[PDB]
Structure 1
Amino acid sequence: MRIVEVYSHLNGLEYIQVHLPHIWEEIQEIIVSIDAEACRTKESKEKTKQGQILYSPVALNEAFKEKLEAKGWKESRTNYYVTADPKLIRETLSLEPEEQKKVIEAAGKEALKSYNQTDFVKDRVAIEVQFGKYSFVAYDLFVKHMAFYVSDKIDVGVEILPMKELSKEMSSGISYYEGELYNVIRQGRGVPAVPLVLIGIAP
């Protein structure tokens, strides 16, 4: 595939270039190596795209996983408990999972187990190949990368999205670089307050 567009939020790319120049190579190489055409297997079933052959997010994901894991990118998961009272949540943010549930219940409140996953993380960098309903991009950007960033676990979040010419050939509901780029640019240029690298591949 080919890196058609690349945007650097709050110097997210320049950070990689200066401290992990090899990672930048790695990421680019990995992208260029995937044969998107080999991933064109999904037969749309929507009434509007009847009998059409689109690129498969499932295939494209398998392609990225295999390649990325092979390079050392491992998954990271954060478990936590949430409750209805905001002040209780604030008092449990620094504690450990088991410990949070404890302080919550120790107040007659209910403790709900949740978590956040990210299949690719390395040297404090988080990669998100995002081919799902477009709302996940804002979720990835304002919730996840930001979560890791403030938690001092990541130093820059990377979000890979398909350009409009690629999403134009995947099932409905999927986001496209151009648009998401807007969602970030639209609101000044310090929001979200997390270094990022939006990459918009698209062969």
Structure 2
Amino acid sequence: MRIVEVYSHLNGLEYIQVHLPHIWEEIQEIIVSIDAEACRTKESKEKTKQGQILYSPVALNEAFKEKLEAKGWKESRTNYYVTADPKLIRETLSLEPEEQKKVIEAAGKEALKSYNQTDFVKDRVAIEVQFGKYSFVAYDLFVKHMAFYVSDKIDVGVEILPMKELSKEMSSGISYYEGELYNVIRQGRGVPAVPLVLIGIAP
């Protein structure tokens, strides 16, 4: 596949190029190695596209998974305890799971265990590949990548998305690069706090 657009948020791309140059080389290689044609096997049942053979998100997801795990990218999970008290939250935000619980419960407040898990993490870099609803991209950017960043698990996050040129060749209602880039820029300079590299791809 082709890398059409790349956006470096908080200079996350430069950080990788300086500290983890092999990671950037590897990500580009993985994308270039994906044969989008072999993933064009989803026969649409939508009335507005009845019969068209579209790119399959399932096939695309499998293709990336195969290449990433083959390069040593592995699943990672980060745990943390949440609570209703804003102050206790700010206090335990950067502490270890065990201490977060201890601190919250020590104040007589209920500690609720939660977490975030992602399939592709390597050398303190997390990659998310998304071919689905708009809401999941917001969740990835402002919650998942952030959770791993705050818990000191990754230094930069990466989000791979289909350009509009590709999303229009998939089932309707799928998030695309241009739209998600806009959602991030709309936040204003410096938000979110986690450095990121947004990548828009096409066949």
CA distances 1:122-157 after superposition (whole Å, capped 9, x unpaired): 111110001120121121111111222222211111
What is the CA RMSD across the aligned residues, in angstroms? 2.2
For 1:185 and 1:86, the matched residues in 2 are separated by 27
Provide closer, same or farther for how the CA distance between residues 9 and 91 of structure 1 changes in structure 2, counting only shifts above 3 A: closer
Check conservation: 2:79, 2:116, Cα contact below 8 A. yes
Check conservation: 2:116, 2:144, Cα contact below 8 A. yes
Provide closer, same or farther for how the CA distance between residues 21 and 108 of structure 1 changes in structure 2, counting only shifts above 3 A: closer
User: Deviation of residue 43 (structure 1)?
Assistant: 1.6
For 2:20 and 2:88, the matched residues in 1 are separated by 39
Counterpart position of 2:29: 29
CA distances 1:73-123 after superposition (whole Å, capped 9, x unpaired): 111012344444545555654565567667767888766543211111111
For 1:125 and 1:79, the matched residues in 2 are separated by 17
Check conservation: 2:94, 2:150, Cα contact below 8 A. no
Check conservation: 2:94, 2:151, Cα contact below 8 A. no
Alignment: residue pair count = 203
1:161 aligns with 2:161: yes
Classify the secondary structure of the residue corresponding to 1:131: coil
For 1:187 and 1:99, the matched residues in 2 are separated by 32
Identity %: 100
Q: TM-score, normalization: structure 1?
A: 0.88
User: Deviation of residue 47 (structure 1)?
Assistant: 2.5
Check conservation: 1:9, 1:189, Cα contact below 8 A. no
Check conservation: 2:116, 2:147, Cα contact below 8 A. no
User: Deviation of residue 29 (structure 1)?
Assistant: 0.6
Classify the secondary structure of the residue corresponding to 2:171: coil
Check conservation: 1:126, 1:156, Cα contact below 8 A. yes
User: Deviation of residue 28 (structure 1)?
Assistant: 0.4
User: Deviation of residue 22 (structure 1)?
Assistant: 1.3
User: Deviation of residue 24 (structure 1)?
Assistant: 0.8
Counterpart position of 1:184: 184
For 2:90 and 2:193, the matched residues in 1 are separated by 20
User: Deviation of residue 52 (structure 1)?
Assistant: 1.7
Check conservation: 1:57, 1:131, Cα contact below 8 A. yes
Higher mean C-alpha deviation, range 61-70 or range 77-86: 77-86
For 2:132 and 2:43, the matched residues in 1 are separated by 17
- Structure 2, unmatched stretches of 5+, are none
Classify the secondary structure of the residue corresponding to 1:48: helix
For 2:196 and 2:110, the matched residues in 1 are separated by 36
Provide closer, same or farther for how the CA distance between residues 73 and 43 of structure 1 changes in structure 2, counting only shifts above 3 A: same
Check conservation: 2:159, 2:199, Cα contact below 8 A. yes
Check conservation: 1:149, 1:155, Cα contact below 8 A. yes
Structure 1's consecutive aligned runs of 4 or more residues displaced over 4 angstroms after TM superposition are: 83-113
- Structure 1, unmatched stretches of 5+, are none
Check conservation: 2:78, 2:151, Cα contact below 8 A. no
Counterpart position of 1:72: 72
